[PDB]
Design a binder for this molecule. Structure first.
Ligand SMILES: CCCCCCCCCCCCCCCCCCCC(=O)O[C@H](COC(=O)CCCCCCCCCCCCCC)COP(=O)(O)OCCN
Ligand SMILES: CCCCCCCCCCCCCCCCCCCC(=O)O[C@H](COC(=O)CCCCCCCCCCCCCC)COP(=O)(O)OCCN
Ligand SMILES: C[C@H](CCC(=O)NCCS(=O)(=O)O)[C@H]1CC[C@H]2[C@@H]3[C@H](O)C[C@@H]4C[C@H](O)CC[C@]4(C)[C@H]3C[C@H](O)[C@]12C
Ligand SMILES: C[C@H](CCC(=O)NCCS(=O)(=O)O)[C@H]1CC[C@H]2[C@@H]3[C@H](O)C[C@@H]4C[C@H](O)CC[C@]4(C)[C@H]3C[C@H](O)[C@]12C
Ligand SMILES: CCCCCCCCCCCC[N+](C)(C)[O-]
Ligand SMILES: CCCCCCCCCCCC[N+](C)(C)[O-]
Ligand SMILES: CCCCCCCCCCCC[N+](C)(C)[O-]
Ligand SMILES: CCCCCCCCCCCC[N+](C)(C)[O-]
Ligand SMILES: CCCCCCCCCCCC[N+](C)(C)[O-]
Ligand SMILES: [Hg+2]
Ligand code: NA
Ligand code: NA
Length: 308
């Protein structure tokens, strides 16, 4: 039973563990540099877990309230990519950093936003459906939006991103969804192992990325951190006003604020490792975002849980 309490604590203190592993990789790169070629498999395991936990009723809100889910999807792909582009222009970021920030911005939402919405006492059904739709549509929308913002010069890289998202995100989500229909209620035993396995997989992606870019973090790490904080923070701000100005209720407003600001930044780190391998700093905005958004997401959720 102690293993369940240990898993619960690790989950409730994720960011602190992710920050420790990022620091371990920063002081000792050779501890996690071996995980680099395993990054696609590590993210694939996380995506398999999402589909495994995904049931057909998680899409009910999409058929009962299509306009609410669609506003969420539009806000995710309009705000985050535009914010990444604006900050890259505003702060005159060097090309490799700007591409890394645009990549994070073009990614779909993160699973953790579902838990943050539950803690914020927001519309959980809406949070779950927006993440699922943004993720399922990402094979086409992530490379197409990346291509428009980062520039038509990265056509080869963006085309390869479509293939990578199919292999690391779509292939595992589907394989996970079929298992849930196959085993039925028996999948609960397999979902209990998921938090620990997923945490281990993501800290290994973070560790591998930080280790491969020590020198680049030594020169631009602080600038990347400031951009990450502003990117995620502005994502909450614009996400709130998009939910409010479309006339959505308070529960939906909290769901969409978190939805927009929180990103599948592990996918961004994976896509940068696979398509811009010769430039290790490109994966850095994604790696730092995976640590940061959980900290800011819990702060915002805590404020709303205290208010309600
Ligand atoms: C470090 C940043 C991490 C976030 C800390 C969150 C602190 C709570 C923020 C807060 O109260 O703002 C809400 C706006 O939403 C927001 O989410 C805006 C906050 C976003 C942080 C911007 C940081 C910029 C860098 C208002 O919410 P309410 O329920 O009282 O609204 C009543 C409707 N009028
Ligand atoms: C890294 C640094 C470590 C420090 C972080 C400590 C934060 C702990 C806060 C905390 O757990 O409190 C919650 C309540 O908030 C409260 O304690 C309420 C405090 C009063 C809130 C008044 C609004 C001001 C907040 C302004 C925040 C600005 C934050 C930006 C830094 C608990 O949650 P719960 O018991 O209610 O959960 C029940 C579920 N619903
Ligand atoms: C379940 C966690 C939230 C913990 C929580 O509920 N805290 C509230 C405490 S309380 O009510 O006051 O008692 C969240 C926070 C950080 C999340 C993890 C991080 O976002 C990192 C990866 C992200 C991957 O895409 C999914 C797995 C994952 C490894 C996430 C699994 C899970 O959603 C975590 C671990
Ligand atoms: C847009 C402008 C006003 C919006 C409506 C308002 O937000 C009022 C309700 C709120 C309900 O949660 C969903 C339907 C809905 C009718 C919304 C559907 C859609 O988002 C609308 C029609
Ligand atoms: C105090 C714990 C630090 C916040 C960690 C938040 N979390 C679990 C979402 O990463
Ligand atoms: C639990 C299994 C989950 C299935 C995840 C499969 C994703 C495969 C990714 C391998 C990609 C290898 N690579 C880097 C050469 O493209
Ligand atoms: C699945 C997508 C459904 C979109 C329906 C559009 C709402 C029009 C009223
Ligand atoms: C539009 C984004 C993708 C949404 C796909 C979600 C699949 C759920 C569709 C329900 C299919 C099950 N059925 C046939 C019983 O309705
Ligand atoms: C700052 C992070 C607040 C942590 C709140 N908590 C305990 C619910 O994870
Ligand atoms: Hg701008
Ligand atoms: Na969500
Ligand atoms: Na998002």
């Amino acid at each position: 039973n102690i293993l369940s309490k240990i898993s619960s604590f690790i989950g409730k203190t994720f960011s602190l563990w992710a920050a420790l592993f990022a620091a371990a990789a920063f002081f000792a790169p050779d501890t996690f540099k071996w995980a680099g070629p395993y990054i696609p498999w590590l993210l694939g395991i996380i995506m398999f877990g999402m589909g495994l936990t995904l049931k057909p009723s998680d899409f009910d809100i999409l058929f009962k309230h299509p306009k609410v889910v669609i506003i969420g999807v539009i806000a995710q792909f309009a705000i985050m990519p535009a914010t990444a582009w604006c900050l890259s222009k505003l702060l005159n970021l060097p090309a490799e950093i700007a591409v890394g920030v645009i990549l994070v911005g073009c990614c779909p939402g993160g699973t953790a936003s579902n838990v943050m919405t539950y803690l914020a006492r927001g519309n959980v059904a809406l949070s779950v459906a927006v993440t699922s739709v943004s993720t399922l549509t990402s094979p086409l929308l992530t490379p197409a939006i990346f291509l428009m913002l980062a520039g038509e010069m990265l056509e080869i890289q963006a085309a390869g991103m479509l293939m990578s998202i199919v292999k690391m995100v779509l292939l595992p989500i589907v394989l996970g969804l079929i298992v849930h229909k196959v085993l039925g209620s028996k999948t609960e035993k397999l979902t209990d192992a998921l938090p620990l396995v997923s945490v281990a997989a993501i800290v290994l992606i973070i560790g591998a990325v930080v280790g491969a870019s020590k020198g680049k973090i030594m020169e631009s790490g602080l600038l990347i951190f400031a951009v990450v904080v502003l990117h995620n923070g502005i994502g909450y701000l614009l996400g709130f006003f998009a939910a409010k100005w479309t006339g959505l209720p308070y529960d939906a407003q909290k769901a969409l604020t978190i939805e927009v600001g929180m990103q599948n930044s592990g996918l961004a780190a994976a896509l940068a490792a696979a398509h811009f391998a010769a430039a290790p700093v490109v994966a850095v905005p994604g790696a730092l975002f995976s640590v940061w958004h959980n900290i800011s997401g819990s702060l915002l959720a805590t404020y709303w849980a205290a208010k309600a």
